[PDB]
Ligand binder design. Structure first.
Ligand SMILES: CCCc1nc(C(C)(C)O)c(C(=O)O)n1Cc1ccc(-c2ccccc2-c2nnn[nH]2)cc1
Ligand SMILES: [Br-]
Length: 467
């Protein structure tokens, strides 16, 4: 068995600690990139440009309509507010009113890239390697991200944000994958938990960076800046030894394991390992099968709906009556208690009842936001914060539940394609937000009605607690 031989060089050790820390380090910036459209594309208060401006029923000047003489649409441009948002992509290329969907199109195009990033670079890691793909993904995001910060017009920004989406998907996919191939079976849950916790710490980093750097060009450049430094040390990564065995390169596998032995200091055991011993140790459809088919759609709907309403709330921080810098801190802050409640309930009640309670409660909070009047800022903000926490507690549960609900043969493929359909939800969520022109609370109603119907799916699943 490979697990027993991985413990020969000491199991978890100095090499394992050093590389896992460096591989998980860019995961802090993963949350910032996924949410960066909130700060780089924030919509400030604006009004038409006189060469004058009607006021709405609320009292503020009516946007994109001006009097012909002291009604006609804006022709000379728009005047924005520099008090809170000095420069965003909305102010730069006039993505207001008529071109309101263009701002959402940036996230949809970016989320198209992250979907194709898992599909393409997932296939590349099987043929090329896990270390080789990581090197080509730390560079790509740094080049694509920086080139996006200097985009001359809008189409160039969308094309260079899509490329950053493809590379970031490869980073996330090859972070957990490369980490588990170099770590023993015993320390497999610690890595899985650490990936999610490091992922949830990125919201705090985004708020701190965006507060000091409000400009969209400087914030985007600074966010993609470390990925050049990550590429500098990404060369010093040891390729997964198990993958080398699967590729018929046992000579490379022996060298990789020997190199680990000297790093951990147990070089005596590494010298014992040899090709004869290495070979002796390592001697060992989803919808096509109705049995797994009726298990796939139920899991797929949970992955889609949980992600569909997640990015329908994280992307819409503005409008709760609180500064977005404070809300981003609070949204990140509610993540840790939400897992604690979920993890305790999961082990005390069951994966299925907890998931249904987490999804149903999350759907109610989102749905009640549209009904509640916008005047009550504190209550409306609190319900959204509670809804965000319950959605996060659903992600942790569905990640655990999916693994236990799949046979060992198809578990790895099911989890990968199960997360793939989750990336599909993050694509449609910005698209649904584009219907806010038809009705103002319609996007919030839809984001709160899909998880409610998704909670009925979990009932059809079989409970796996204590089984
Ligand atoms: C908090 C964001 C949730 C999310 N975003 C994405 C995008 C950016 C579209 O890729 C996906 C996806 O890859 O499908 N997901 C799903 C996800 C589920 C569980 C977890 C998780 C939860 C707890 C502990 C660990 C993890 C985990 N496993 N692998 N990576 N993180 C992380 C992400
Ligand atoms: Br991800």
């Amino acid at each position: 068995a490979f697990n027993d031989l991985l413990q020969q060089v000491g199991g978890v050790g100095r090499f394992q600690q050093i590389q896992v820390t460096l591989v998980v380090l860019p995961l802090l910036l993963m949350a910032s990139h996924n949410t960066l459209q909130n700060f780089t594309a924030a919509i400030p208060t604006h009004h038409c440009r006189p060469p004058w401006l009607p006021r709405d029923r609320q009292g503020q000047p009516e946007s994109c309509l001006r009097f012909t003489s002291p009604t006609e649409p804006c022709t000379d441009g728009w005047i924005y507010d520099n008090s809170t948002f000095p420069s965003t992509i909305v102010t730069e290329w006039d993505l207001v009113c008529s071109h309101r969907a263009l701002r959402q199109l940036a996230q949809s195009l970016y989320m198209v890239g992250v979907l194709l990033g898992a599909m393409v670079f997932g296939y590349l890691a099987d043929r090329l390697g896990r270390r080789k793909v990581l090197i080509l993904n730390y560079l790509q995001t740094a080049v694509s991200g920086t080139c996006a910060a200097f985009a001359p017009n809008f189409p160039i920004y969308c094309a260079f944000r899509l490329l950053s989406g493809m590379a970031l998907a490869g980073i996330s996919l090859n972070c957990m994958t490369l980490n588990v191939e170099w770590m023993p079976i015993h320390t497999r849950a610690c890595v899985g938990t650490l990936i999610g916790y490091v992922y949830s710490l990125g919201q705090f980093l985004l708020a701190g960076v965006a507060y000091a750097v409000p400009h969209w060009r400087h914030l985007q450049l600074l966010v993609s800046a470390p990925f050049f430094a990550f590429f500098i040390y990404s060369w010093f990564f040891i390729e997964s030894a198990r993958w080398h065995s699967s590729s018929g390169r046992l000579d490379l596998t022996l060298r990789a394991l020997q190199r680990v032995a000297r790093i951990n200091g147990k070089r005596e055991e590494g010298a014992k390992l040899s090709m004869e011993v290495l070979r002796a140790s390592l001697q060992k459809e989803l919808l096509r099968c109705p049995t797994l088919r009726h298990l796939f759609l139920c899991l797929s709907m949970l992955w889609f709906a949980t992600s569909f309403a997640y990015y329908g709330l994280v992307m819409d921080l503005q409008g709760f009556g609180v500064s977005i810098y404070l809300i981003q801190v609070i949204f990140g802050a509610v993540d840790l208690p939400a897992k604690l409640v979920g993890f305790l309930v999961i082990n005390s009640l069951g994966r299925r009842p907890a998931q249904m309670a987490a999804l149903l409660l999350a759907g109610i909070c989102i749905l009640l936001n549209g009904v509640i009047p916008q005047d009550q800022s504190i209550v409306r903000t609190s319900l959204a914060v509670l809804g965000k926490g319950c959605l996060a507690a659903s992600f942790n549960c569905i990640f655990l539940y999916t693994g236990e609900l799949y046979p060992t043969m198809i578990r790895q493929t099911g989890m990968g394609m199960g997360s793939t359909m989750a990336r599909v939800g993050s694509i449609v969520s910005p698209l649904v937000s584009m219907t806010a022109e038809l009705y103002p609370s319609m996007p919030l109603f839809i984001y709160g009605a899909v998880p409610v119907a998704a909670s009925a799916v979990t009932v059809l699943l079989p409970e796996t607690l204590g089984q």
